[PDB]
C-alpha cells in the first residue's frame, strides 16, 4: 500500500496526538513535499445533526492572509470543509486564518444543536498528515 | 491490594514487585505462605533495604538447594513390592504417603507435600514415574518400578 513518501508523511507527525494551535502551524512545512505550493483545507466536525435541516451551518468567512474570502457548508454527515490559503503563507498567518474560522462557526451556532459543538478540529495540506488541533 | 512480594510468583512477580492482586489471593495464599507481605508504609522499608540487599538472595540459593534436591538419590529409582493379586492387580493401592516414606529411607529425604502421582494412584504392577516437586519450576523424574510381591 504505502511507500517512500506516504509513510514518512505519517512517521514525522504523532498520529495519536492533538497539537496546540501554535504547534500545528509550524510543523506543516515538514509534510508539503511536492514540486508546487500546496494549500491547507480545514476539517471541522460540527456536533450538529446533518439529518436535521433546522441545524444546517452555512456561511462565508474572510481570510486575513487570503489564498481571499472562502465559502463553506458541511456534508450530509456532520463535517464541514474549506481552505485557509497557501501552505507557504507563514505559520502565524494560518494561525490568524484558523482561529478566524472557529469563531465564524460558533458565529453560526444552530438553536437545536444539542451537544458539544466542535469536538475535534483538524487541518492538513495537499499531501498532508492527519493533524488535529486543541 | 498492593502487596509487595517475597518470592517468584509464577505469573506476575519477580521478588520485589508492588503488584496489585485481588484481596482473596493475598490474604489466604500469599500472606500465610510467605510468598508476599502487605505493603503498608513501614513494612515496605523493611524489605527495600534490609531484605532486598541480603535476605532476597538468601532464598535464591535455597532454590539452589532445590537444585541440590533434584539429585539427593543416586540411582534415582525406588522399587516397592507390596502384597497384590494375580496378573498384576495390587491388593491395597499405595499412595503419596508411602512414597514419601520410600524415598526418604532410600535417598531423597522428602516430605509428603513434595510427592506427586501424575498417573492415578498406582494400582498396576510395573513402570511408573513419580515426578517429585523439588521446586515449583524444576522437578524430578524418579522412575518407580512397582513389582507384584
Amino acid at each position: 500500500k504505502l511507500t517512500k513518501r506516504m509513510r514518512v508523511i505519517r512517521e514525522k507527525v504523532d498520529a495519536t496526538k492533538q497539537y496546540d494551535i501554535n504547534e500545528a502551524i509550524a510543523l506543516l512545512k515538514e509534510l508539503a513535499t511536492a514540486k508546487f505550493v500546496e494549500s491547507v483545507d480545514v476539517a471541522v466536525n460540527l456536533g450538529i445533526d446533518a439529518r436535521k435541516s433546522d441545524q444546517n451551518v452555512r456561511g462565508a468567512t474572510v481570510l486575513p492572509h487570503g489564498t481571499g474570502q472562502v465559502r463553506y457548508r458541511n456534508d450530509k454527515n456532520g463535517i464541514i470543509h474549506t481552505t485557509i490559503g497557501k501552505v507557504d503563507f507563514d505559520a502565524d498567518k494560518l494561525k490568524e486564518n484558523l482561529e478566524a474560522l472557529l469563531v465564524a462557526l460558533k458565529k453560526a451556532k444552530p438553536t437545536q444543536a444539542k451537544g458539544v459543538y466542535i469536538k475535534k478540529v483538524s487541518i492538513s495540506t495537499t499531501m498532508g498528515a492527519g493533524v488535529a488541533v486543541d | 491490594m498492593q502487596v509487595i512480594l517475597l518470592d517468584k510468583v509464577a505469573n506476575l512477580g519477580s521478588l520485589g514487585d508492588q503488584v496489585n492482586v485481588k484481596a482473596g489471593y493475598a490474604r489466604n495464599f500469599l500472606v500465610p505462605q510467605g510468598k508476599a507481605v502487605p505493603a503498608t508504609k513501614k513494612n515496605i522499608e523493611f524489605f527495600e533495604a534490609r531484605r532486598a540487599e541480603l535476605e532476597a538472595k538468601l532464598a535464591e540459593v535455597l532454590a539452589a538447594a532445590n537444585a541440590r534436591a533434584e539429585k539427593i538419590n543416586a540411582l534415582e529409582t525406588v522399587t516397592i513390592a507390596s502384597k497384590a493379586g494375580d496378573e498384576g492387580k495390587l491388593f491395597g493401592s499405595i499412595g503419596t504417603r508411602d512414597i514419601a516414606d520410600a524415598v526418604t529411607a532410600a535417598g531423597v529425604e522428602v516430605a509428603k507435600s513434595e510427592v506427586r502421582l501424575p498417573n492415578g494412584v498406582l494400582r498396576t504392577t510395573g513402570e511408573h514415574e513419580v515426578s517429585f516437586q523439588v521446586h515449583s519450576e524444576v522437578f524430578a523424574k524418579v522412575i518407580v518400578n512397582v513389582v507384584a510381591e
Binding site: - | 491490594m1 484481596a23 490474604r27 500472606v31 500465610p32 502487605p38 503498608t40
Partner: protein, 77 residues
C-alpha cells in the same frame, strides 16, 4: 450471638416499609462469616467470627494489631 469480634457489630432492627408504606418490624443482621486468620507472631491459625467489613479492617491494620484490641476487650480468640 451474631456479634462480630472486630467491629463489634450486632443485629440492629428496623422497619420494612412496603409500597403502601406499611411498617413491619424486620431485623438487620451483620454479614458474619467464620474466617480463619494467619498470625505471623504465633505462627498458627486464629479463628475469629468476623463480618465482611471486619475483614477489610484486619486487612488495613495488622492481624495482631486487631487481636491486641480484642485482648484488651477480654475476648477469647
Amino acid at each position: 450471638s451474631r456479634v462480630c469480634q472486630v467491629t463489634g457489630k450486632r443485629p440492629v432492627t428496623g422497619n420494612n416499609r412496603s409500597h403502601a408504606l406499611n411498617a413491619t418490624k424486620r431485623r438487620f443482621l451483620p454479614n458474619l462469616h467464620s474466617h480463619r486468620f494467619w498470625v505471623e507472631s504465633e505462627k498458627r491459625f486464629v479463628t475469629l467470627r468476623v463480618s465482611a467489613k471486619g475483614m477489610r479492617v484486619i486487612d488495613k491494620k495488622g492481624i495482631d494489631t486487631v487481636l491486641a484490641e480484642l485482648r484488651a476487650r477480654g475476648e477469647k480468640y
